[PDB]
From Swiss-Prot, chain A:
Belongs to the eIF-2B alpha/beta/delta subunits family. The gene is EIF2B4. Activated by the chemical integrated stress response (ISR) inhibitor ISRIB which stimulates guanine nucleotide exchange factor activity for both phosphorylated and unphosphorylated eIF2. This is Translation initiation factor eIF2B subunit delta. The chain holds residues 166 to 520 of 523 of the full protein. Its main location: cytoplasm.
UniProtKB/Swiss-Prot annotation, chain B:
It comes from Sandfly fever sicilian virus (SFS). Belongs to the phlebovirus NS-S protein family. This is Non-structural protein NS-S. The lineage of its organism: Viruses, Riboviria, Orthornavirae, Negarnaviricota, Polyploviricotina.
UniProtKB/Swiss-Prot annotation, chain C:
Keywords: Acetylation, Cytoplasm, Disease variant, Initiation factor, Leukodystrophy, Protein biosynthesis. GO terms for molecular function: guanyl-nucleotide exchange factor activity; identical protein binding; translation initiation factor activity. It is found in: Cytoplasm, Cytosol. Belongs to the eIF-2B alpha/beta/delta subunits family. It comes from Homo sapiens. Transmembrane segments: none annotated. This is Translation initiation factor eIF2B subunit alpha. One of its GO terms (cellular component) is membrane. Component of the translation initiation factor 2B (eIF2B) complex which is a heterodecamer of two sets of five different subunits: alpha, beta, gamma, delta and epsilon. Subunits alpha, beta and delta comprise a regulatory subcomplex and subunits epsilon and gamma comprise a catalytic subcomplex. Within the complex, the hexameric regulatory complex resides at the center, with the two heterodimeric catalytic subcomplexes bound on opposite sides. The gene is EIF2B1. Acts as a component of the translation initiation factor 2B (eIF2B) complex, which catalyzes the exchange of GDP for GTP on eukaryotic initiation factor 2 (eIF2) gamma subunit. Its guanine nucleotide exchange factor activity is repressed when bound to eIF2 complex phosphorylated on the alpha subunit, thereby limiting the amount of methionyl-initiator methionine tRNA available to the ribosome and consequently global translation is repressed.
Curated annotation (Swiss-Prot), chain D:
Pfam families: IF-2B. Belongs to the eIF-2B alpha/beta/delta subunits family. Activated by the chemical integrated stress response (ISR) inhibitor ISRIB which stimulates guanine nucleotide exchange factor activity for both phosphorylated and unphosphorylated eIF2. It is linked to Leukoencephalopathy with vanishing white matter 2: An autosomal recessive brain disease characterized by neurological features including progressive cerebellar ataxia, spasticity, and cognitive deficits. Brain imaging shows abnormal white matter that vanishes over time and is replaced by cerebrospinal fluid. Disease severity ranges from fatal infantile forms to adult forms without neurological deterioration. The disease is progressive with, in most individuals, additional episodes of rapid deterioration following febrile infections or minor head trauma. Acts as a component of the translation initiation factor 2B (eIF2B) complex, which catalyzes the exchange of GDP for GTP on eukaryotic initiation factor 2 (eIF2) gamma subunit. Its guanine nucleotide exchange factor activity is repressed when bound to eIF2 complex phosphorylated on the alpha subunit, thereby limiting the amount of methionyl-initiator methionine tRNA available to the ribosome and consequently global translation is repressed.
Amino acid sequence: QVPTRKDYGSKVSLFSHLPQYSRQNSLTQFMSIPSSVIHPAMVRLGLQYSQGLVSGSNARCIALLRALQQVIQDYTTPPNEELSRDLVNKLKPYMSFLTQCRPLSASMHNAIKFLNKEITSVGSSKREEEAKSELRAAIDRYVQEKIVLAAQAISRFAYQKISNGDVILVYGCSSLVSRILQEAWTEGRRFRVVVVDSRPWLEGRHTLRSLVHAGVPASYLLIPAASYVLPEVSKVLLGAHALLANGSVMSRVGTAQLALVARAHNVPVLVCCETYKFCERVQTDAFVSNELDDPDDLQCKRGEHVALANWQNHASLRLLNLVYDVTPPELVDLVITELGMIPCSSVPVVLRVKS
Amino acid sequence: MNSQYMFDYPAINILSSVSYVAYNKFHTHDVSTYEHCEIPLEKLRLGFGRRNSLADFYSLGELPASWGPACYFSSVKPMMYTFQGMASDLSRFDLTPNVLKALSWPLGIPDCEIFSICSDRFVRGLQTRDQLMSYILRMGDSHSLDECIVQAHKKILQEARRLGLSDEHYNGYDLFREIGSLVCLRLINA
Amino acid sequence: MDDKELIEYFKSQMKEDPDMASAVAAIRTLLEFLKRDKGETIQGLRANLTSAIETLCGVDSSVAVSSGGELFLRFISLASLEYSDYSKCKKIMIERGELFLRRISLSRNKIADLCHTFIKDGATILTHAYSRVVLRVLEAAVAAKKRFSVYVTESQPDLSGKKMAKALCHLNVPVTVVLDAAVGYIMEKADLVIVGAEGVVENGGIINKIGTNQMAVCAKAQNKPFYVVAESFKFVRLFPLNQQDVPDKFKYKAEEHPWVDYTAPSLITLLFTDLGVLTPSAVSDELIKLYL
Amino acid sequence: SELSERIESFVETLKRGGGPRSSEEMARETLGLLRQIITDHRWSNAGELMELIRREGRRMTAAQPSETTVGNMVRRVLKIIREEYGRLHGQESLHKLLTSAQLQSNIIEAINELLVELEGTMENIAAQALEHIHSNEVIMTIGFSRTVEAFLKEAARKRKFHVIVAECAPFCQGHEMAVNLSKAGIETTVMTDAAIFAVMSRVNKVIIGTKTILANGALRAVTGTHTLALAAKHHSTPLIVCAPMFKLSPQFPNEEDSFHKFVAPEEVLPFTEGDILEKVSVHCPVFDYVPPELITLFISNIGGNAPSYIYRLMSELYHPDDHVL
């Protein structure tokens, strides 16, 4: 049986319903070196999630789907059994272990749902090798037409909204935004880009390193100084990790703050995302369901001391570093998908048309 | 996205023929039309206005939505091209000295189907698109159709200015008409 | 026909019945062009139609003409998908266009019947400028034996507010003409605001005469309802981000005199169309369903 | 005959006083009554059945327009006949404009499955309740409504939080929720209406029920709900409405102003005052109109939804022709 991960540190009272794991503690200590309970692809993928080697939502979904393809190729049905439900029953513990390594995201949840619906739809008369080949082809087709073509269409649509000489503000690291900016610059547009980052991931330096390599003029600053630069900003472009049915945008921690400050400065806000990230569940805030990262990441060596070195030694001291937060629909103007540019409140409609 | 809708998709192959497949759905890129033929603007942009001298479009990287005789409202200022008489005269002449390398151009190899294309007894119908598009692809050196069209137009302009043929009198309203006129004139020369 | 019977026929249709909107006349002219097409190709047919779109858009460049043209283009594409042969599909295009004209000719009556309930007795309506839909709705309300007052702005760039005030006082309704600058002064007396629309954008906002936005903004300050009456064919897949994002071919040509501005959907309470009574977010859905 | 007298008894009960207090009981009784109406009355074509249903629903609605569960259940049934007739013989949108005798058993089974799914709306709401309440939250409700009480008293099985209940004067039925919910160990508080804003700053989110939800997303609730929603919007606290699917009715606010329900002014002002009761006019409405701009979310037996999407649920429940009934 797969052991459970132990919580590290004392959690905030409001977040007692969420887990909090340390990066040092990995489940592999209590697993057989030749993987028997779970497939080696599953344990490798969980290891490279729990260690933070894969961060982007698209990257996480792609890696999960590739590992699932590996498992499907390696799968063999048992006698007196059929693939249709045995495959799902075998897959469930793998998803549980993956959640144990790190909580699932919207992209992975949608991918799991789609794969379950595809496997359940596999006819009983199908042959094992033919069924495996069909599942592999379906996964490849889903990846292609739900990431690559979606990104191309989104970039083409967003090209129109970008005019010459304007200033565009981005936030964090996101493949879709970087691709949009690079393709817009390549097509002939001339503009500056303002990059906003935040502690402790500091993932913005990712996309910045891309923009400099594309020749795009750029500017860099931390999130608190955004109010200083928003007067000269014309458009705001953000990446969304999830779109909720009520129009709320479930994204990185600083997204809602930047949207609020931009709205206060009277600057339009743009959001580009793929349809496969549209969830059906809703949440009104960032407290009911969120993610607690490693609290030790908050420590920063300023001067010659780390002010939060032995933070556990203070009984009444708690550390809190969310990973996600929710932006209300009123602070958003666009949702840019392969379907086109739609209002932020049209998310449920798409949810209906994709089924 | 009405400008992005498609009816027939041009499938290409590389003796450099072009087919049409039934494709009744919106395309990922804007499409222009010319003589019942559809060209996906996969690497260019759409144009506007009734400006003459079609070269002025792709010089900006754009390409007009529609033009040519099939368009009742051609935006490239249609004009006469008073050279199709010799095209009809030589239409029934088949493939079999100076004339060989005279008509090797503009393709660089002898070719006679151009006269049949420019012949009067050849209606610009829906069934003729295949041979027209295949010829325009073969006579160009690219993969997407719009680069083939622009290559054709600039090669026509190059050959016209080679003999000093009043490039102003050659806009590109009906590409194959200029093809036939140049072939007839250079066959008259040799 | 070719580029001369188009404009003349469109103007004749507009002038013979001046109580009929520009978009309806444009759609009827497009149908007439389709009738006398004398060409046998679907691709060429759509090319000629889309050329007719901007040769008609040269005059009376209001957004309604463009919306009607886009609707006609989507209709002819939809029909083609349904069938296969230009020959046979031509007559079905013609009959579908006739039925479409018949259905859209009742939009005013349907909107009036739907919307007359929203006026209270003793109410005070506020109006920006002339719009036949508003006049029809108020006529329906009068036919219901209701009592109310009407304040109308004067629409300074062209004094059409006075024209609609004359047309309304012809109906024995107590009306009051006010300056375009007096809106903030006046609306505190107004019980609710009803305006027309020259086009509906993706999110739900409207595209209307220059003053409209101001009223809407002031309305949001006064917590008063803001109702917009517009037909179905006034939908378009345009999404301005701000006032300067709407295409300049609509702002000008009917030291800086625009003619049309955009109002965000957040300031709109309800849309009254021939499709029914909709929330501002509904329109996108409908306009999405047209292209899926 | 017997069905006719049962219908008359039902109408008299609605006119005088609601016997079955819960709205779910109203829905079940209305659907059952429609079932005997369909089985007993004779009809050849579907048109006469539809007009008979129109007449009966008109009578029942005219008995008491204050509550609309009967009306929209009748409209749902009418849509059921419309769908079955279209299926066995063969939605307004731009697509429609541009493009262009054995059904009794099907109707009966449709009504039966509708009753079956209506039975478990409370259970589905309770099942999805746990995803909107976090530990040590502060929740405020108004009046009495079984949906939200089941919601909270089951979601507290794995969480601990504080609940504030404001008595819905004059019908101080919030005390009933307070007692019932404190009988489950939730650490609740009993409060008057006049203090709502006074405490509204220190509340994380507010969950309320409703009596009827209109097409535009605006709803009709107990008196004082509009003030609570206004305070919520002022403090920007999210507002959750827990309403089963049958509480969705397709009318609109401005309809003859027979919207509220005025009861005897005895509750507000006792009869013992005496002489001053002549010159003084007293009003005691029991319902208030909450606009859709102050609503954040809708929780129903099918899940979460936004107010801006409510119109779509109208198209999937009620045919446009049957709004007038």
